[PDB]
Design an enzyme around this catalytic site. Structure first.
Site, short mmCIF file in Angstrom:
data_model
loop_
_atom_site.label_atom_id
_atom_site.label_comp_id
_atom_site.label_asym_id
_atom_site.label_seq_id
_atom_site.Cartn_x
_atom_site.Cartn_y
_atom_site.Cartn_z
N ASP A 182 78.24 82.36 36.96
CA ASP A 182 77.21 81.94 37.93
C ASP A 182 77.16 80.43 38.07
O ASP A 182 76.65 79.74 37.19
CB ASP A 182 75.86 82.45 37.34
CG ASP A 182 74.73 82.27 38.32
OD1 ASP A 182 73.68 82.95 38.17
OD2 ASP A 182 74.87 81.49 39.27
N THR A 183 77.66 79.91 39.18
CA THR A 183 77.71 78.47 39.41
C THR A 183 76.32 77.92 39.76
O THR A 183 76.12 76.71 39.83
CB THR A 183 78.65 78.11 40.58
OG1 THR A 183 78.16 78.83 41.75
CG2 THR A 183 80.06 78.58 40.34
N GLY A 184 75.36 78.83 39.96
CA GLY A 184 74.00 78.41 40.28
C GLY A 184 73.18 78.24 39.01
O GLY A 184 72.13 77.60 39.03
C1 LIG Z 1 69.37 85.69 43.74
C2 LIG Z 1 69.76 85.15 42.38
C3 LIG Z 1 70.54 85.79 41.55
C4 LIG Z 1 70.37 85.37 40.05
C5 LIG Z 1 70.07 86.46 39.06
C6 LIG Z 1 71.26 87.29 38.88
C7 LIG Z 1 71.30 88.72 38.64
C8 LIG Z 1 72.60 89.30 38.66
C9 LIG Z 1 72.72 90.70 38.75
C10 LIG Z 1 71.63 91.49 38.30
C11 LIG Z 1 70.37 90.89 38.10
C12 LIG Z 1 70.21 89.50 38.27
C13 LIG Z 1 71.26 84.51 39.81
C14 LIG Z 1 70.79 83.05 39.72
O1 LIG Z 1 71.73 82.10 39.76
C15 LIG Z 1 69.54 82.84 39.11
C16 LIG Z 1 68.96 81.46 38.80
C17 LIG Z 1 68.87 80.10 39.58
C18 LIG Z 1 68.38 80.08 41.01
C19 LIG Z 1 69.13 81.25 37.28
C20 LIG Z 1 70.07 81.94 36.55
C21 LIG Z 1 70.29 81.62 35.18
C22 LIG Z 1 69.38 80.77 34.53
C23 LIG Z 1 68.48 80.02 35.28
N1 LIG Z 1 67.38 78.98 34.32
S1 LIG Z 1 67.95 77.47 34.38
O2 LIG Z 1 67.08 76.65 33.60
O3 LIG Z 1 69.39 77.55 33.94
C24 LIG Z 1 67.95 76.96 36.05
C25 LIG Z 1 66.80 76.43 36.61
C26 LIG Z 1 66.83 76.02 37.97
C27 LIG Z 1 68.01 76.18 38.67
C28 LIG Z 1 68.13 75.83 40.15
F1 LIG Z 1 69.40 75.21 40.27
F2 LIG Z 1 68.09 77.08 40.82
F3 LIG Z 1 67.07 74.99 40.45
C29 LIG Z 1 69.15 76.61 37.99
N2 LIG Z 1 69.13 77.05 36.72
C30 LIG Z 1 68.41 80.21 36.67
C31 LIG Z 1 68.60 83.99 39.12
O4 LIG Z 1 67.46 83.89 38.73
O5 LIG Z 1 68.93 85.09 39.78
#
Ligand SMILES: CCC[C@@]1(CCc2ccccc2)CC(O)=C([C@H](CC)c2cccc(NS(=O)(=O)c3ccc(C(F)(F)F)cn3)c2)C(=O)O1
EC number: 3.4.23.16
Lengths: 99, 99
Positions: free
Chosen positions: B25-27
């Site tokens: 996950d690049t997000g």
């Molecule tokens: C529509 C989103 C899909 C996803 C969940 C994936 C999923 C896969 C299959 C089955 C069920 C669920 C993937 C995603 O990248 C995240 C987010 C960021 C938007 C996410 C994922 C991992 C950790 C984080 N916490 S964090 O502190 O690493 C963080 C905080 C903020 C952000 C920002 F870049 F989105 F601001 C990114 N990362 C966030 C999430 O919450 O949902």
């Protein structure tokens, strides 16, 4: 272009003529955008993420420019912390993951 | 390898001696794994996603094998619906986004 991941992979998107920033997220099946007005009718949807489920409005066939590339498909609108471009539009722009 | 995004980018990972499936996950800024036992001291943290925040335990300096590639870094352990490999470890393996 080629994007490394030392920083968050944010890009510019043009939607409804407005410029917004968005996150390229390979872990997202769909594309989720913050609250805004889009044309047309919407259908209900519920999507899961890291902290639980949210309810969004689905709009079909929305035109969106991503880093100058044109994509046309489904956009979900709802209470998201950032604009997310997910797999449904990444495949349209030919985006791949390489290592 | 080159990974296309027509399907979820799930890969096999080795952590703590166990084998697991994880999503690239690049997000995600951080790597978050389903509840499991890891050795070492940890610190509680809250991380946000779509749906809200979850409380996780932060382990540092953990070694993971991603598709036979070794990488080291911080791993968060908690009630996540899916094992996610975020940027913190994708950079270590040389993963990039190409379009
Ligand atoms: C529509 C989103 C899909 C996803 C969940 C994936 C999923 C896969 C299959 C089955 C069920 C669920 C993937 C995603 O990248 C995240 C987010 C960021 C938007 C996410 C994922 C991992 C950790 C984080 N916490 S964090 O502190 O690493 C963080 C905080 C903020 C952000 C920002 F870049 F989105 F601001 C990114 N990362 C966030 C999430 O919450 O949902």
């Amino acid at each position: 272009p080629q994007i490394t991941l030392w920083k968050r992979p944010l890009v510019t998107i043009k939607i409804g003529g407005q410029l917004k920033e968005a996150l390229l997220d390979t872990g997202a099946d769909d594309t989720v955008i913050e609250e805004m007005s889009l044309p047309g009718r919407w259908k209900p949807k519920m999507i899961g993420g890291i902290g639980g489920f949210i309810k969004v409005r689905q709009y079909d066939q929305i035109i969106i420019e991503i880093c100058g590339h044109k994509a046309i498909g489904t956009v979900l609108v709802g209470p998201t912390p950032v604009n997310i471009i997910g797999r449904n539009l990444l495949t349209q722009i030919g985006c791949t993951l390489n290592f």
